[model samples]
Target chain A: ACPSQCSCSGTTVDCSGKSLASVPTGIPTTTQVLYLYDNRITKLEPGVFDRLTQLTRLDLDNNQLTVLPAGVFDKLTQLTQLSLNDNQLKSIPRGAFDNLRSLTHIWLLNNPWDCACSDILYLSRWISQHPWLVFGYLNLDHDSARCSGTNTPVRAVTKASTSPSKCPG
Target chain B: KVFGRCELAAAMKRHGLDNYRGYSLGNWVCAAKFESNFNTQATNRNTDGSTDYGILQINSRWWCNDGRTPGSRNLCNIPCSALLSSDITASVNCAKKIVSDGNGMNAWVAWRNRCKGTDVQAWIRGC
Candidate 1:
């Protein structure tokens, strides 16, 4: 357990390979890049980056997190890239990156996501606009199965399999 | 498909069968409900001692002048008469022609914008 605040001052903190349960809070607002990779972390506190206003990049790969709080990256408006591959996430809330309008890159592959219904609908429309920024690094073949959600049996929705034959009536 | 009487009426009127755009869609429905109960194939004499045909309530005599004989009649060819008998695509084609005429295009452009969920006034400016 780390304290709610830190007095460390530097451009980067090589806190990799540590037994951290979550992202350490208050690692000085001036820290531009955080290298907390290879740590034993899970849940992230809401708005953990509130004080890290200058943080441009965060490395939290290979974590056991299942959910990310909405607006967690609101303060990091300057953050352009985020790496969260190999996590146990299941869902992403709408407008999760609403304030991160400057965010141009995100690594979301290798996470178990329920990619059906509203999730797929919104993501499909969003990807149509920002295709290059989603699922960086990891292969999509692995994500396909995990993102299809827990296949619960239910009545299927009807849709046209192919475009209907158009003849002037 | 059989219960598309309202759509049939709309389709007929869209093809210049009857320029009945002054009424809102609800009004159109209400009119149909009151006159013919929304029946596209409805044909009966009105209580006012006049005859009515289709959802638009066109007189059968007006269609007789258009050369639609009983044996040679196909419902889709006659607009504003027998709704299902009238050509479904006629309205859209007539609308396209009207829109291409420039004067009617602006209103249609506005309608397209409204269909796409945009500001109605912005669509009127030029879509």
Candidate 2:
């Protein structure tokens, strides 16, 4: 039986706040929308979503994740919306989202971004090249996504995107 | 001279960082390799007029102060020169604080570009 904590309604699965440390198995492969926010998941195994190619939206915000394994989202080619805000993610591997050609909106705010030349330079460049891709809000004033370095001025994602040379030499 | 791959791995492990802040030893070795090629005296000047120091290439913008920089945060509370030394103790401590502050290894762009998705186990295989 599916975990009693989840409420499955057709293709959408709402499994928020169940205090889960991992993604639940037995989720219907045909499910197109899944919410696993506000849990304790620390790591996502590679190929975890291999069977969920039909997924269009996925949310994993407010969890305890530190790193996302390579190819975790490789199969979610149809995914259009994803939320990874408020987690502890540091670096996203290159090509992690190469297959998500349909992705239009992604939430990457609230995590402690490094914002250095080595960590975020390419990401800022990539995001700038894809202006159609929208990021989550960093504050009520719409300050844009930022780094947490205290001495470094709050570099907005948009500003950084256009100024890759401004990153550490 | 810069450290060899095995030498860097051994030094990192000796510093009690086989697994630090939930990041693997491979992560550390890979980052160091890409950032400075294991050079403890490496430095890079950013376009924003800031500099990165040492193997991990700690930034002057937020972590250290070098007097020449106009607005350094000095969160590590150490002189940027300390990071340039061959003795990695100060650099290691500063890096630990950076990771503890929630950036993990995301502080280095080299790590993101080269080591993030690749298999880094060989970095610490024999060590």
Candidate 3:
């Protein structure tokens, strides 16, 4: 569960990946801009973000996360930006970002991303066109290698790099 | 159903309409009545065979031309499903920038007179 004595404000929280597997209870419902990067979290409990209806910016970068529980962010109707960079993630569910109608920015850099997948291709295409939201960093070095072996183009990152790099598969 | 006025207000605020002096929901209703009988998703056709889409009657060809895909200026490069779509917001903000940075409220007044009476247009013109 959440760490003890976690501090929470309106939309901004100081919960920066302090080994928390669950968010603290009694935090305000209107809290947004959560900072939970660099934690040991592997799964987010169901309804974890249920009460944070006004959540906008969520930072889950640099963790050991491999999967996000379904509907974890479903109730976060006002969420606009989500950061999932630098994790152990190898897959993202189809429509993982679907419920987020207001979502615009999604960060997925610095992970051991798999390139030989259709989902990665679709994501690459989607992000390439949506430069406004997906403009920061994307690791795209393994795309060619994956595409060369498969009929469908694979666009996952094979190599790791820093910000401002183009997406690869 | 519960109304999300706070959400709507936040959306408007994020789009810089919180401090607007002219438009509101009442004005929107009036304009919608004048434009397409309060239909939020109305479209019209031009004499040259081009089409205008949405409650705001946005011109599709002007935004999405054959030479360019969705996402370029001088065309509608993004889907107009919502007037507040990311690229549409960019377009609106761009126009706002051009008008506000140059002539201030007078430009808006002129725009209102030109596209007056429509709901979303009036809201855009006023607020």
Candidate 4:
């Protein structure tokens, strides 16, 4: 059975455009595309999505998530598109995306990534190497995931992570 | 004024809501149970600056003639205040119009989120 607030259409579970405070429980293990954007989701509990191995696309844009627990996406090996734009995330915790082998596109725009912290260095390198792999209504075509303080796109600031001025906290 | 489960069901049934436009009596009861918790006086302002009224939580912008929404259509052609009255005829009438007008119960998020496709009979089990 699908979660109460969501509509389950075959493999797709759409919970978009609700006032959901967190990821709802009982998402079917057979679900593939899960839309949770445009909601008020503030946190993602550990192992909440442990069974969604069939999942491919998960949109978490326009939410209130400040942090993601490690291993949260480890089970989502089939996931390809993920949207985390327009949220309050400061940094993605290490190991959150380590096992997302099929992930190619992730939207990370409009988040307040603290460039001044060493914590961001991990993501900076990740973004630099794998690329943000962004796509919009059309290709964004430029680095758009900028840090709050430096105003430089995170991909451009991977070298700055080792700078004294960038790490002053 | 909050309504007990059976009382709300009875009132809606008496108003000819059972199987009205294909929605069951249980739907009306379950919808009210989640939308305003059966509270006749409930009001919630939306992010778009529209207000919901009554046990049905009908919107003021398109449904009722509330002055809050500057360009409201007032499709229901009734004052929004009447939707909030202790007696619920105006609210029930408005709800019926909304459904027959093609919006159906999907207009209320409470119905879509909590009432649609669930054990609606459980809400009015005793009655």
Query: In terms of lDDT, which candidate is strongest?
Result: 4
By lDDT, the candidates rank as: 4, 2, 3, 1
Interface RMSD, prediction 4: 15.7
Model 4 RMSD vs true structure: 19.3
How far off is each candidate at the interface, as Cα RMSD in Å? 30.1, 13.0, 18.2, 15.7
| Reference interface contacts recovered per candidate | 0.00, 0.00, 0.00, 0.00
Checking candidate 1 for backbone clashes, the offending pairs are: B15-B91, B75-B85, B75-B86, B76-B85, B76-B86, B76-B87
TM-score of chain B of 2: 0.90
Error (Å) of candidate 4 at residue A1 is 1.0
Q: B67 in model 2: Cα distance from truth in Å?
A: 57
The better-scoring model by lDDT among 1 and 4 is 4
Sorting all predicted structures by TM-score, with the top scorer first, yields 4, 2, 1, 3
Question: Which parts of model 4 have CA positions greater than 4 angstroms off?
Answer: A140-142, A159-169, B1-127
A54, model 4: CA deviation in Å?
A: 0.6
Best by TM-score: 4
Return the TM-score for candidate 1, rounded to 2 decimals: 0.44
Global fold similarity of model 4 (TM-score): 0.53
The DockQ of each candidate is: 0.01, 0.01, 0.01, 0.01
Candidate 4, residue B93: the lDDT equals 91
Instruction: Give the per-residue lDDT of model 2 (tens digit) for B28-74.
Output: 88988877888999998864346888988887855898876543457
Predict model 4's lDDT versus the native.
0.77
